[PDB]
Amino acid sequence: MERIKELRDLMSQSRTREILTKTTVDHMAIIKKYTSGRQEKNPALRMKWMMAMKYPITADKRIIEMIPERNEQGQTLWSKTNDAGSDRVMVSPLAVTWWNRNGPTTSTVHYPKVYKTYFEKVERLKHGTFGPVHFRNQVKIRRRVDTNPGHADLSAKEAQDVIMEVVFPNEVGARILTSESQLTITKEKKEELQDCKIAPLMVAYMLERELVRKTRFLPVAGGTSSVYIEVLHLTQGTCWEQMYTPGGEVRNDDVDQSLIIAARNIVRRATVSADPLASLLEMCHSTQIGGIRMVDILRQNPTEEQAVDICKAAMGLRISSSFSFGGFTFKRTSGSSVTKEEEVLTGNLQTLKIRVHEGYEEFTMVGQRATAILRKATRRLIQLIVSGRNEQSIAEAIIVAMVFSQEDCMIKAVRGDLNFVNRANQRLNPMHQLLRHFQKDAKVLFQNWGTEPIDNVMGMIGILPDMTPSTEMSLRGVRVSKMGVDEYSSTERVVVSIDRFLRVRDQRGNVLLSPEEVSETQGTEKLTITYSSSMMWEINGPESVLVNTYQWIIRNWETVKIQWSQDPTMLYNKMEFEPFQSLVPKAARGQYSGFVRTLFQQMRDVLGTFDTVQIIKLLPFAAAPPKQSRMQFSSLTVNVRGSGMRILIRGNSPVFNYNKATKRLTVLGKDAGALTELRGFLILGKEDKRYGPALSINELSNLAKGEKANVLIGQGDVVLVMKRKRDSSILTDSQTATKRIRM
Amino acid sequence: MDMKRRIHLELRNRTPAAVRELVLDNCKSNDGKIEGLTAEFVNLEFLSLINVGLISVSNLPKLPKLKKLELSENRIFGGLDMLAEKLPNLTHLNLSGNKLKDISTLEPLKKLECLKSLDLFNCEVTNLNDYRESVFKLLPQLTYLDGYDREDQEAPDSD
Amino acid sequence: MEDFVRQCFNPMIVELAEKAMKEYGEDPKIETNKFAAICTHLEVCFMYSDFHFIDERSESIIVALLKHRFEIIEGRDRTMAWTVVNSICNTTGVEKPKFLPDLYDYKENRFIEIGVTRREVHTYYLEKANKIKSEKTHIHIFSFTGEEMATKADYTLDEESRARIKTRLFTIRQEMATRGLWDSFRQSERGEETIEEKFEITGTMRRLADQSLPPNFSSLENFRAYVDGFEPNGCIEGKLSQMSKEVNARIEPFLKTTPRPLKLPDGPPCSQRSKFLLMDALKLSIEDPGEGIPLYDAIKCMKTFFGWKEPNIVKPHEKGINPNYLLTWKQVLAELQDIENEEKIPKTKNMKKTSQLRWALGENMAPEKVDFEDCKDVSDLKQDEPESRSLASWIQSEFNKACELTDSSWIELDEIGEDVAPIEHIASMRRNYFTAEVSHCRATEYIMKGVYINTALLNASCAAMDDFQLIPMISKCRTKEGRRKTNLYGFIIKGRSHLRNDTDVVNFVSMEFSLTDPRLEPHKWEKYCVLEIGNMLLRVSRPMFLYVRTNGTSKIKMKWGMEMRRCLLQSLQQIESMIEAESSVKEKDMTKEFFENKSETWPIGESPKGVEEGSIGKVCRTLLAKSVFNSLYASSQLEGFSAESRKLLLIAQALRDNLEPGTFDLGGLYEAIEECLINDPWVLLNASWFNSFLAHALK
Amino acid sequence: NDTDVVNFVSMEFSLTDPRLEPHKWEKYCVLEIGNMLLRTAVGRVSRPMFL
Amino acid sequence: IKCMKTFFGWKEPNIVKPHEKGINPNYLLTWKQVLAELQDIENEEKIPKTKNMKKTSQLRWALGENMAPEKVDFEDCKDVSDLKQYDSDEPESRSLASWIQSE
């Protein structure tokens, strides 16, 4: 009631009305920065001066009614002076202690959970373990490491969407309501901070401090974790190392490796297709890693792996200029190069075609367990300085540089036939073939490289061909460095053109990440990968096939139910169940199917037997040319990696268990999803008086599936809104309209 | 949601005479007893009182047709004599996670005529020596104790 | 912008727009507003056509064998688009419009043309109607704000499908406004064409850029053309080979015979200028176990001494009214006498603004501030080389004494949490060793004296702006036995302290008891007026003198003097650095070896018998004393010296390493060092130290 | 010498919940690694598997 | 490996009872590393017959290799106030519990 009076009196004078009417809500933050005053140079001096006088600290005009003007000894706690221009009365610091002693108590249960990012530190140090101090000469490389444990791997922009939805529910914007990404954290925090009276702005700040990651490029000398870098001041020193261990909890970096696996599979199956771009984009916009759409993950994570790099590049995202070879990423600092595919002969007089990198260039060869700086000219390993832990890592870095030295000595020193194939049985890059040929043994290559004297400059142990120290004799251009070699503090993100064969060239014309140097391993992802195409399901093995089939049935439960109860024949022959029928034994697909079909019919005849879980469990066996037999099966077999798993008709089993007391279904341990045994709105126009006065984003909870109401969206404007019918997503439907024209 | 509520929530506007399987777990007990169920439940044959804080089964209803009762995760420390008379046809009992601490406590079950399984996991009585043999001698009709019959052969499925 | 274009719009529509620009020879990167406009147009067209199917009859449905109800014309090439338009026009017998409709609807057999505007839909629709009129083409115009219009108020879609595109337009507007791009995008629209950002240098700023060019050129355009058509023709090497050969570095060797002693200045001996007496300071003590009040202890200590004579002036000031100082001391004595007669230690004593005290505090000078009108008539108007003063031994004596131990524990530091970390125990051991070796040095006494006096004077200056409050000069020790002790060195009488900025000076007068006869070193005490007051028995009766002077201070100097504990920090930092280096070298902790073995010694002093070494304790004490004197005698000259002397020291040390140091101009470096040695005792003493180091190191 | 210790980490599987006798596991760090289906009296019940 | 392929109910490890005077996170990560190492053996060709685990901070701390005190000659550690005869007095008496009888 007073604020509207304030607005009226502001508008009364016709000079602030211009600012208050012509400044769109967009141009408010740029008006908020026209502050007055001169701030204050030398604030410590000003504080030491202020505390000398009385009444230093300003407080709002409420102390007057809850803090006596004098304590029980006659000392004026607060004054009445109205600092500068404001209602804030001046106050002496005695008032702070008076409040802290004779003040209104309260219950603080929301503090240990709003300020989780500090009590976590407290409880992590309280359980830390200490070890002996070792006074060895410490070597401190300059790694760029995470400095915010438990950051919840959100970016700096979706964290804002989480804050606006937990602390400011009535100011949410269009981009959130008219969406279908609720996130899980926003449902936990909304429940926890349900009655907090702390400081909405402070709650927002703490949430964005907890839900963001940061890096600092610090002189680390071990650990490198997200928790070992907060206690860097305690663990390492210029001449000491105090062995230490935080005792809290860690993050599971499994989403990143799941993303890597999904990207690898997608790129393979898109390049083996007719139009790689369409397959890549459709899969990215459709495939989901553990429920989340892969596009969100790609736009969220910073993971730098080949397959993920190609996936991002095909989606028009900036990718690091650094190229990864042999597990080490090579940041160019200077020079130019040209691929210039030329011909050479190997040690066994075998013809070979390799991109002779023509041009002098210097690289920082940063890696997981080693670092190096390598400057080389065309077929000239000019200099290579290496550092790391133990001589194994040093040898790995040296051999990687030697392989990518462009020297023909390695080519002519080959021992064997350079015919290497990968898991997919493909023709790998000849330089890469050399890399794996020499990755095991290079003794003869070391002998060919020879050894030269070193002058002992500043202290730099040389490396012998036997990978042993030597203060006088060292390999050619290889100078193992003490006191560590520092990494780099930047990645130089750039946009790189992508050819049609998954070879990520650049505007300069140097290949960064060829598609053949990606099949390092094909292990099993920890999360679940779900694809929207029936063909993709038979890629990662029987486990993925079963999980995807059941998750698809769950995804479309209402359609499956209506078709099963109305037109069962059409349902029982869909395409999505053909991959599943590949697993079921050939000699029992019929006998099984009939048993299910007949049983399903029993549900339609007698009411009250409509069991959702049973139907979802048994449905994939229906798709077959059913036969008839009196046999009453107890469990239906399935073939998984040559082993016969069993699905129980009445009960739970490893292949399928729907956990009660919850809606979650698990298949072979892999999480399937939720089965049921705010958002989603659509804008329609500006204010329309036919629908009455405007609402608030809260009241929109009371609407039907199609009712139209006009709401005050976000900070300001009112827009007519309505709930949506049909999912209305951006899946293959959008691609069809776009890819069809691309014919 | 205590029992009286969830019962109705699980009644689903369906008369008690037409329930054959009722599930009431994690809900509550008034103080330590089942309250909300009534004798009009006559068609019931599967009652699951799991995790309901339950100190005794003194005030259990009378269910002629009950065959699958389970009181796991509760804190019953005796008073099982009632189950005999009140559930004459019970044939699958699941007393796992309770506070039973003596073979004597299982004496009342000897007079159930049709008994086929008695799960007794995580109960202080299972730490005794010759535990299974003593139970199988106190309850001769039993044919599956904890899941295995007499020679540690798992009970066949489809029970 | 383009980054957002790629982010939101999928690669499909991105490539469609790419080929669309390529058809018209538009750079997808130089032009970005048009790129975004085309992407939006294509996406709205596709979303319009999509999710609609025509049955065998003429009706619309939403989603296997049925037509789309919509033919895409925009997503194709120009030639292909006109081909499709002609085909459908011939098949349906409907006149082909002169323009190119972006979509065709079969259900009404009408050419639907879509247009997305960024302003009021009214102007866009009116312009489109003016351009196209009297043809059966249906215009559908959308806006990013939710507005929407169509011909005859007819919208050929269901409400839910007209919503799924307005929603995305609104979302794009929001996401393009939170990035600061929306404002630029809006103004990029004119009529239906999307102009590109333009920044024109014309007018004065073009006549002010056709003058800011190298001498030969005469316009920015010509210079830019030259730079664009510039190819390195070896111009650098062509001038390196014709520039006069005199220009060069000409490295000159730096041999052990090269160093030359710094020429210290010549003139009258330097006189002390510190705020308070350093070594010639008497100390009236009391064994108070005290109320924490200054005047309480001041009166007690004053009464502790019996023998106060009638004050006598021993040495005048030579530029001041010595009788005023004499009567000032007498007035202070009398005022202290008054407090004895009741008032029960008023906790604060304001002096009386008498003529003597007012004069002594600088007051009444206030030279006039007239306007130039009178100045143009007077015959005397001006603003001066500061006199150069040589080095005297008294500063070296001050330092020698300040590097000595005493019978006290001058510094009492606060508490630290318990120690759990095996490194925390080592840190505590090292810190305890340092504090034990340094808690008694007279430099720590100066640290305290200075910080206490400045804190008290700051509090007095803030509290009583307009009163000549009497500020004692108290300090507090902890005698070797353990009993606390309080000490009075003198009295300070603050002046008018109406300090507005950080450089406003408050003038005060300091009176400090002493035993050193002023006539032994008459050149030290040139700024002082010294009296004789009482005789102290020690057993002989030695006269006790009072050293009165009128100094001045400001807030910045006050906070500067409140950091001699930072000076302590610097000393400990250096010692710990040395210990850590040796510990790393020997692969263990040398704290105990350094601080207990007493065999290791560093060369710190210079007696007649060559460099005289001293244990680590003396190193800590002397470094702390050096830091304290830096904090006391700070000035611009000292920093200038420190800098160039550091350069010369680094050159000398490089020579001592046989690194073959060179130099391009050493006479200039020596002149730079010598330009800052003029009239500062501390600076001249540092110069003498540097000369001795040169004589002893390089030889 | 045949008295030097060779520290080793031992990681057992089990089904016994730690919280029943927390005083017996003073020296262990007990995790929860799986969910094993066991044949109970009424059907087949899922019980946690600890390490 | 042929035994751990018999179980399909692996879940995300969770600490249900901490050591309360020890190193919990590095006990968790040693298990999460054993699982990874066993996965790597499966992917490789032929069984190595002996899997040496990667020497990482987790194993070093869990094994106690980073907790053991360092040997120092008595001359250096004379002043350290915490020196005491090893096993000076720790016969902490603990009363009988039933778990041994059940065992």
- What's A416-473 look like in SS3? CCCCCECCCCCECCHHHHHHHHHCCCCHHHHHHHCEEECCCCCCCCEECCCCCEECCE
Return the half-sphere exposure (C-beta side, CA atoms, 13 A cut-off) of residue C376: 3
Query: A112 in contact with E at a CB cutoff of 8 Å?
Result: no
Q: Is the dihedral angle over the CA atoms A138, A143, A144, A150 positive or is it negative?
A: negative
Query: A661 in contact with B at a CB cutoff of 8 Å?
Result: yes
DSSP 3-state assignment of A300?
helix
Task: Give the C-alpha separation, A283 to A289, whole Å.
Answer: 11
Q: Which chain B positions have a beta carbon within 8 Å of E101's beta carbon?
A: 127
Closest chain D residue to the Cα of E21, Cα to Cα: D27
Closest chain D residue to the Cα of E65, Cα to Cα: D7
Q: Among C269, C270, C333, C275, which Cα is nearest to C547's?
A: C275
**CB-based contact A131 E67, cutoff 8 Å:** yes
Longest Cα–Cα distance in chain E: 59
Resolution of the determined structure in angstroms stands at 3.2
- The one-letter amino acid code at C487 reads N
Task: Give the C-alpha separation, B109 to B135, whole Å.
Answer: 10
- Cα dist from A6 to A9, A152, A711, C558, whole Å: 5, 42, 25, 46
The residue with tokens 């020196």 is E83
- The one-letter amino acid code at C556 reads I
Helix (DSSP H) and strand (DSSP E) numbers for chain B = 3, 5
Task: Give the C-alpha separation, C263 to C676, whole Å.
Answer: 11
Is the CB of residue A105 less than 8 Å from the CB of residue A66?
Answer: no
The residue with tokens 């395409």 is A575
- Provide the 8-state DSSP code for D14: B
State how far residue A635 is from chain B, nearest Cα, in angstroms.
Answer: 10
Q: Among C314, C362, C321, C330, which Cα is nearest to C525's?
A: C314
**CB-based contact D44 A659, cutoff 8 Å:** no
- Tell me what percent of chain D is helix, strand and coil, each rounded to the nearest 5: 5, 30, 65
Query: C592 in contact with E at a CB cutoff of 8 Å?
Result: yes
Task: Give the C-alpha separation, B40 to C348, whole Å.
Answer: 93
Is the CB of residue A511 less than 8 Å from the CB of residue A504?
Answer: yes
Task: Give the C-alpha separation, A114 to A689, whole Å.
Answer: 42
The residue with tokens 């010294």 is C530
Q: Among C329, C339, C226, which Cα is nearest to C549's?
A: C329
- Provide the 8-state DSSP code for B106: G
Say which experimental method was used. cryo-EM
- The one-letter amino acid code at C155 reads Y
Q: Among A443, A475, A434, which Cα is nearest to A348's?
A: A434
Q: Which chain C positions have a beta carbon within 8 Å of A685's beta carbon?
A: 146-148, 166
Q: Select the residue of E39, E61, E69 nearest A523 (Cβ to Cβ).
A: E39
Strand partners for A380? A377
Q: Which chain C positions have a beta carbon within 8 Å of E80's beta carbon?
A: 425
Longest Cα–Cα distance in chain B: 50
Q: Which chain A positions have a beta carbon within 8 Å of B26's beta carbon?
A: 661
Q: Which helix (H) or strand (E) holds C129?
A: helix C121-131
List the Cα angle A389/A393/A397 in 5-degree steps. 125
Q: Select the residue of A135, A244, A714 nearest C584 (Cβ to Cβ).
A: A135
Q: Which chain B positions have a beta carbon within 8 Å of A635's beta carbon?
A: 157
Is the CB of residue C488 less than 8 Å from the CB of residue C544?
Answer: no
Q: Among C111, C93, C105, which Cα is nearest to C59's?
A: C105
Q: Among B111, B81, B112, B75, which Cα is nearest to B96's?
A: B75
- Cα dist from C656 to A457, C254, C374, C696, whole Å: 18, 11, 65, 12
The residue with tokens 């307005």 is C166
Q: Token digits for A391?
A: 């001589």
Query: E94 in contact with D at a CB cutoff of 8 Å?
Result: no
State how far residue A698 is from chain B, nearest Cα, in angstroms.
Answer: 27
State how far residue C241 is from chain A, nearest Cα, in angstroms.
Answer: 28
Report the DSSP pairing between strands A473-475 and A451-453: antiparallel
Q: Select the residue of B25, B26, B158 nearest A634 (Cβ to Cβ).
A: B158
**CA A627 from centroid of its chain's CA atoms:** 49
**CA A675 from centroid of its chain's CA atoms:** 26
Q: Among A535, A552, A521, which Cα is nearest to A288's?
A: A552
**How many residue pairs from chains A and E have C-beta atoms closer than 8 A?**
45
- The one-letter amino acid code at C226 reads Y
Query: B127 in contact with E at a CB cutoff of 8 Å?
Result: yes
Residues after which chain A has a gap (C–N > 2.5 Å): 677
Strand partners for B74? none
Is the CB of residue A484 less than 8 Å from the CB of residue A141?
Answer: yes
**CB-based contact D37 A659, cutoff 8 Å:** no
Count Cβ atoms below 10 Å from residue A498 Cβ, excluding itself: 19
Q: Token digits for A449?
A: 């490289």
Count Cβ atoms below 10 Å from residue C389 Cβ, excluding itself: 20
**CB-based contact E57 A223, cutoff 8 Å:** yes
**How many residue pairs from chains A and C have C-beta atoms closer than 8 A?**
149
**How many residue pairs from chains D and E have C-beta atoms closer than 8 A?**
69
Query: D29 in contact with E at a CB cutoff of 8 Å?
Result: yes
Task: Give the C-alpha separation, E23 to A445, whole Å.
Answer: 46
Q: Among A235, A325, A717, A731, which Cα is nearest to A518's?
A: A325
Q: Select the residue of B48, B118, B122 nearest D41 (Cβ to Cβ).
A: B118
Query: A648 in contact with B at a CB cutoff of 8 Å?
Result: yes
**CB-based contact C588 E79, cutoff 8 Å:** no
Q: Among C448, C451, C470, which Cα is nearest to C460's?
A: C470
Task: Please name the residues in contact with C227: beta carbons below 8 A apart, sequence gap of 6 or more.
Answer: none
- Provide the 8-state DSSP code for C136: S
Task: Give the C-alpha separation, C335 to C356, whole Å.
Answer: 14
Q: Token digits for A591?
A: 């006998």
Task: Give the C-alpha separation, A53 to A69, whole Å.
Answer: 18
- The one-letter amino acid code at C490 reads G
